[PDB]
Design a protein around this ligand. Sequence first.
Ligand SMILES: *[C@@H]1O[C@H](CO)[C@@H](O)[C@H](O)[C@H]1NC(C)=O
Lengths: 42, 48
Amino acid sequence: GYFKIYSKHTPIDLPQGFSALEPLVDLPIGINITRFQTLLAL
Amino acid sequence: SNKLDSKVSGNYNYLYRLFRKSNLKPFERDISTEIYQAGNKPCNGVAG
Ligand SMILES: *[C@@H]1O[C@H](CO)[C@@H](O)[C@H](O)[C@H]1NC(C)=O
């Protein structure tokens, strides 16, 4: 019932290398999730 | 809480669920008012 988001940023197909991810946000929402979609800035 | 959740004429505000397609998972809430599909014929969003 929690939403955990981990994020990482870097300067540059996916590149070859190792880069771990740090935790940023935990949202205690608890909603049944089945699908998702993204949004661009046209 | 019989002195606060009951009335002489009957308190119909509280409602519960009697029929569902599958058992609920732990820590889940369902507020869907869709008609239960007991038979093969669709309910068409109306009692019958
Ligand atoms: C979440 O929604 C999907 C959509 O069909 C459903 O199959 C699943 O049973 C739902 N799970 C819960 C826990 O509500």
